[PDB]
Amino acid sequence: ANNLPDTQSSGPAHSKETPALTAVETGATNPLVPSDTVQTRHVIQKRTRSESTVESFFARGACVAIIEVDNDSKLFSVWKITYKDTVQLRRKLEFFTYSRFDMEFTFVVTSNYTDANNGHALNQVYQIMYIPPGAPIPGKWNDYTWQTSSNPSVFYTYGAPPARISVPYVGIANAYSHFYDGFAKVPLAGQASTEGDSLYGAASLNDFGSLAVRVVNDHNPTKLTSKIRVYMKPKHVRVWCPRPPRAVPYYGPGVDYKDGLAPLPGKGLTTY
Amino acid sequence: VVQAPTQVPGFLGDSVTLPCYLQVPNMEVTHVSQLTWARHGESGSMAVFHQTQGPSYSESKRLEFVAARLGAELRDASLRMFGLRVEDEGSYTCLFVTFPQGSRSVDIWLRVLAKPQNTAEVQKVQLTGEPVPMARCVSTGGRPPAQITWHSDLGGMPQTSQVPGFLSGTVTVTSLWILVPSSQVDGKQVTCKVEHESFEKPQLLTVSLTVYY
Amino acid sequence: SVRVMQLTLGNSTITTQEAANSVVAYGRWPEYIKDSEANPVDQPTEPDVAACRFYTLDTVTWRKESRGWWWKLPDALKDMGLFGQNMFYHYLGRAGYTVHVQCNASKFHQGALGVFAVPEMCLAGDSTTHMFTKYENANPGEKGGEFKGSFTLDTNATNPARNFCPVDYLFGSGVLAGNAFVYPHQIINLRTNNCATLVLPYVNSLSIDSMTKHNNWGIAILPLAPLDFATESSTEIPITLTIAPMCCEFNGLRNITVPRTQ
Amino acid sequence: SVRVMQLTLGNSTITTQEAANSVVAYGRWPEYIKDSEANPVDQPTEPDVAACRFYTLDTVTWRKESRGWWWKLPDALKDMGLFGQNMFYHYLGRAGYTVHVQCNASKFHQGALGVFAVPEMCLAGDSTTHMFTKYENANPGEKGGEFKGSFTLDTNATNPARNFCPVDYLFGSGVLAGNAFVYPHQIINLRTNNCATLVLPYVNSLSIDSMTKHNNWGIAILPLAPLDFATESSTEIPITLTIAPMCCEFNGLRNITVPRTQ
Ligand SMILES: COc1ccc(OCc2ccc(COc3c(Cl)cccc3Cl)cc2)c(Cl)c1
């Protein structure tokens, strides 16, 4: 996040040192600066790379999900936690193979009457319950699971500033894997083809669990719908192994492609 | 509001225009009104018609911009791409900018590739039975293949085999011929209807026959 | 000089008289797990010279029409001597590698091969079903696979191939191949060098993992400039791949694993 | 080494991988006029980077039948960017040069070019009238001229050509060409080098002179050993000439000079 070096003045040359010539076969990039190939003046550099630090690049709340609940089973909804339901944050994360950070979740809740001239309801309160992989998932908008004696819940009152909570680095590995070239199972010799088969590039069937959202108020016959837009921001970021960015449209959770396979336009070789 | 009609064939050779009409309602009129065109297209991120004050050619040398610019109008602008090779699709977009809400528009695209030419030839001598007299409907030069249709006068038509496409320079070529069997007369207005949907009414070529001895 | 080298590992030595230096991926040389980064508590096995030696996988042939080749590690070495034995007898395994690609021609030949080492090299499949490639197809072993010039969707619903369909310009994963240079690599330009040498440390989000379930590195070879010779439309030059595992340590010994095949 | 170099002047850089050293004429590097050798009293203009940079003149082609080429300095650079502007706006001008001649072929080609830098390179005319060559013909500019294999007297009395008739073996001036080696030079022998590089200081009997009336240096290129290839009676290889003025200083500014042409 710092300063750039100054440009030193450089005069003419006539020597056996040729920085302009190189050999990219080695796998290295030629570290030339302007003064290597032209005469330069002294410039005191004041520009910095403060905004391109790994932290500043991700320091934005991106939408990862839009959970919908109809307060007239739709009285409650469950969202399997992921960053792949949307494309924008996903593409930025995928510039790297591994990552490690904390997360900040902000929830923007909106609601409205479906009918322009019918129904009425008192102010709604929402419960956003996190169900860690293993915990019982709600079957009804009002069954015993909503007691949350151990699961973390967030109760949001409609109209209040967006709710917000922080989550630590929760991975079971030392870093989050954006790419996993493997399987969760190894098919063994002799077992039925139905056996030992698993998805390519998938780890746990339930990585991070899911969110169960519901309106706590008793539902009125009035037609109402609410949407909880989930925004996530990685804070305290560290990333490893850069990768080229996604060039063609995403086709699922994997690196699969199908449709926009011809991303580049035509342009004449000798056309400026 | 956005009302672009551009779903255009699009004729090849070429050349034809690539228009963009944005009719403006009507009591909340639009500025700033710069117009952008993004191709579709390996767009990272330019082959662009942009027009701030003076029309700027983002480098695709083969372009023509015709709008009442450097002043204002605003934009029912027309573009043109010549030429003259099939730098095809893909697709094209047309996006505007606005002081009110309108830094936005719609992607809109279509066709290209090219029209054909036709002639009729009829021979040879009738030693039957029982094929060709013989009328051939040659169709030279059209990448999107022209639907050649041999018909005539009677039920002596069901007999129409095709030369498929062994393509010339970028452009596809075919030949439908008949066959039509045997025997005598000259003499009928046997008409080959070659289409392609360009020009005016489809290429209707009527001919005769080689009658011998 | 930058051009002459000799690599000795165990009982195997490699010599080259036309190198273009060597690349050490991410500037990290392979190493063993430190006590501060250790996870499994059992005593590891370290075969050393018996496993850390040069193994020559099958030779492929480069023609004017070749699109490219790919291999997965440790997969390509699963049947290689005592390295493969240790891999299958243990639940967990870790290793680094010295990849030496060989390709000689003459002063009248042209062509350039881009040799890339990719961590977590996930490839694209052939169906509309996501992540459908089956284990047997994803792990070809020493013979590896090939890149294609275009995507072709498998439509046989009765008998889906469940295979990869790596398109070359899309780097087999939906990214542009020209950007693959952000991964450790070397280029074998026929007018300059014979080979490419890459030293790969162990890369993963864990200190040790299952070698049978997970492939850490992928080796991709793409013809950047096609093979051409004098006037012989007909030209074929072999590309031999020699890889040596380094700092191998395995944990969790039990009965041997026999994976399902074909 | 003696063979690899890089020359940087202003915004232009030249690289070579097959040089045969460089020659600095008379061992003198170009310099500005010292106060002890100064003559015009007015403040000089020194364009520096705007004029002292590499300018590429037109490329000529060498064939088995070529006799040679010649250019005059500063004449050949009179239309070159800001150097030409300063030359024409000032009564007096002074400059040194870095002449870089380029000519590459292959290992199956032969030929040797003698590149000579001659101070006061006066050439012979075509008529019986002495010193009859006219200004327009003596100053061809960047296209320069050519040597001939024989002397041919212009007899058209009505319309005399008033041109030069430089015979090659007579060095275009009545002296034997084999003795032209007493002038700073280099040889571009195809089996050895790509180019010839000569650094020329300002040479004259005055500290500064009129650049329009007087040419200080002459560049002569003669095929010492003719061009030959494999078995192609037909062979053509280009010879490009890149020159950069050095330590330019002009005196006596007024309105621009527009010389008569053709
Ligand atoms: C590589 O990029 C990643 C890695 C992990 C991720 O998700 C991990 C994750 C695990 C638990 C929770 C649970 O968080 C919550 C809690 Cl306790 C209470 C209330 C609401 C929430 Cl929301 C949320 C996210 C995401 Cl979104 C991107």
Nearest neighbour of A39 by CB, restricted to D11, D22, D98: D11
CA distance D164 to D125: 4
E-only strand ranges, chain C = 5-9, 12-16, 23-24, 55-56, 60-62, 69-73, 90-102, 109-119, 145-146, 185-189, 195-200, 217-229, 237-253
Burial string for D204-217 (b: 16+ CB within 10 Å, else e) reads eeebbbebbeebbb
Q: In 3-state terms, what secondary structure has residue C238?
A: strand
Overall residue count recorded for chain D in this entry:
262
CA distance D168 to D70: 11
Asked if the Cβ–Cβ distance from B42 to A263 is below 8 Å, we say yes
Alpha carbons within 13 angstroms on the beta-carbon side of residue A33 total 12
Smallest CA–CA distance from A98 into chain C, residue: C205
CA distance A67 to A231: 11
Mutate to test the pocket of ligand 1, among A148, A170, A210, A241 (most ligand atoms within 8 A of CB): A170
Spatial contact of B149 and B193, defined as CB atoms under 8 Å apart: yes
What's the A154 CA to ligand 1 centre distance in angstroms? 14
Alpha-carbon distances of B9 from B16, B112, B116, B170, C24, rounded to whole Å: 9, 6, 15, 18, 55
Pairing mode, strands B49-51 and A163-167: unpaired
Asked if the Cβ–Cβ distance from A272 to B39 is below 8 Å, we say no
A interface mutation test: which of C115, C131, C210, C261 has the most A CBs within 10 A? Answer: C131
Closest residue by Cα to atom 11, ligand 1, is A208
CA-closest candidate to residue C195, choices C239, C148, C255, C235: C239
Read off the tokens for C17. 């008289």
Spatial contact of A250 and A258, defined as CB atoms under 8 Å apart: no
Overall residue count recorded for chain A in this entry:
272
Domains in chain C with CATH codes: 5-253 (2.60.120.20)
DSSP A39-107: -B--B----B-TTSSHHHHH-S-EEEEEEEE----TTEEEEE--S-SSSHHHHHHTTEEEEEEEEEEEE
Residues of B in contact with A267 (CB under 8 A): 47, 59-60
CA-closest candidate to residue D57, choices D37, D34, D44, D74: D74
CA distance B104 to A81: 32
Asked if the Cβ–Cβ distance from A18 to D10 is below 8 Å, we say no
User: Strand order of the sheet with strand B78-80?
Assistant: B17-19, B78-80, B64-66
Residues of B in contact with A271 (CB under 8 A): 59-62
The answer to whether residue C242 neighbours chain A at the CB level (below 8 Å) is: no
CA distance C9 to C98: 10
Left if phi > 0, otherwise alpha if psi is -120 to 50, otherwise beta: which for B10? left
Overall residue count recorded for chain C in this entry:
262
Alpha-carbon distances of A249 from A88, B40, D207, D231, D253, rounded to whole Å: 11, 13, 71, 56, 65
Secondary structure element (H or E) that encloses residue A210, with its range? strand A210-215
Read off the tokens for B2. 């956005």
Spatial contact of C107 and C239, defined as CB atoms under 8 Å apart: no
Distance of residue A185 Cα from the nearest chain D Cα, in angstroms: 57
The overall longest dimension of chain C from CA atoms, in Å, is 62
Structure method: cryo-EM
CA distance A227 to C241: 56
What's the A80 CA to ligand 1 centre distance in angstroms? 10
> What's this structure's resolution in Å?
9.0
CA distance A77 to A109: 14
CA distance C20 to D56: 34
3-state secondary structure chain D: CCCCEEEEECCEEEEECCCCCCEEHHHCCCCCCCCCCCCCCCCCECCHHHCCCCEECCCEEECCCCCCEEEEECHHHCCCHHHHHHHHHEEEEEEEEEEEEECCCCCCEEEEEEEEEEECCCCCECCCCCCCCCHHHHCCHHHCEECECCCCCCCCCCCCCCCECCEHHHCCCCCCHHHHHHCCEEEEECCCCCEEEEEECCCCCCCCECCCCCCCEEEEEEEEEEEEECCCCCCCEEEEEEEEEEEEEEEEECCCCCCCCC
CA distance A100 to C34: 21
Residues of A in contact with D22 (CB under 8 A): 14
Tell me the β-bridge partners of A13.
D8
Secondary structure element (H or E) that encloses residue A185, with its range? none
Pairing mode, strands B49-51 and B32-37: antiparallel
Q: State the closest ligand 1 atom to the C-alpha of A208, by its place in the atom list counted from 1.
A: 10
Read off the tokens for A114. 């479906």
Burial string for B68-86 (b: 16+ CB within 10 Å, else e) reads ebeeeebbbbebbbeeeeb
What residue ranges line ligand 1, CB within 6 angstroms?
A: A 64, 81, 83, 93, 99, 103, 105, 128, 130, 152, 154, 165, 167, 170, 176, 208, 211, 232
- Gap sites in chain D (C to N > 2.5 Å), preceding residue numbers: none
Handedness of CA B95, B100, B101, B103 (dihedral sign): positive
Task: List subunits contacting chain A, requiring 3 or more Cβ pairs under 8 Å.
Answer: B, C, D
Spatial contact of A258 and A247, defined as CB atoms under 8 Å apart: no
Q: Does residue B102 have a cis bond before it (omega within 30 degrees)?
A: no
Asked if the Cβ–Cβ distance from A181 to C121 is below 8 Å, we say yes
CA distance C248 to C51: 7
Q: Interior CA angle at C30 toward C24 and C31, to 5°? A: 150
Residues of A in contact with B87 (CB under 8 A): 266
CA-closest candidate to residue D91, choices D32, D138, D45, D140: D45
Position A151: which residue type?
N
What are the percentages of helix, strand and coil residues in chain A, rounded to 5?
A: 10, 35, 60
Smallest CA–CA distance from D52 into chain A, residue: A12
Q: Which residues contact A193 (CB under 8 A, 6 or more apart)?
A: A187
Distance of residue C256 Cα from the nearest chain A Cα, in angstroms: 11
Overall residue count recorded for chain B in this entry:
213
CA distance B167 to B188: 32
CA-closest candidate to residue B143, choices B86, B82, B202, B204: B86
How many Cβ pairs within 8 Å bridge chains A and D?
Answer: 47
| Residue carrying the six token digits 């990448």 | B143
Q: Report residue D138: phi and psi, to 5°.
A: -75, -25
Read off the tokens for C150. 């275009």
The answer to whether residue C193 neighbours chain A at the CB level (below 8 Å) is: yes
What DSSP state is assigned to residue A222? S
Handedness of CA D123, D127, D133, D137 (dihedral sign): negative
Which pairs from A146-152 meet CB under 8 Å and 24+ separation? A146/A212, A146/A214
Alpha carbons within 13 angstroms on the beta-carbon side of residue A188 total 7
Burial class (CB in 10 A: 0-12, 13-18, 19+), B166: exposed
Distance of residue A89 Cα from the nearest chain B Cα, in angstroms: 19
Read off the tokens for C42. 């059992």
CA distance D117 to C200: 57
What DSSP state is assigned to residue C83? H
What DSSP state is assigned to residue C206? S
CA-closest candidate to residue C216, choices A180, A244, A96, A175: A180
Alpha-carbon distances of A151 from A128, A145, A148, D169, rounded to whole Å: 10, 9, 5, 102
Asked if the Cβ–Cβ distance from A271 to B62 is below 8 Å, we say yes
Alpha-carbon distances of D108 from A21, C106, D156, rounded to whole Å: 25, 16, 46
What's the A68 CA to ligand 1 centre distance in angstroms? 18
What distance lies between CA D81 and its chain's CA centroid? 17
CA distance C47 to D262: 87
CA distance C180 to A27: 12
Spatial contact of D23 and D2, defined as CB atoms under 8 Å apart: no
Tell me the β-bridge partners of B138.
B119, B175
What's the A208 CA to ligand 1 centre distance in angstroms? 7
Q: If contacts are CB pairs under 8 Å, which of residues 194-233 in chain C contact chain A?
A: 196, 198, 203, 205-207, 210, 212-216, 218
Tell me the β-bridge partners of D117.
D219
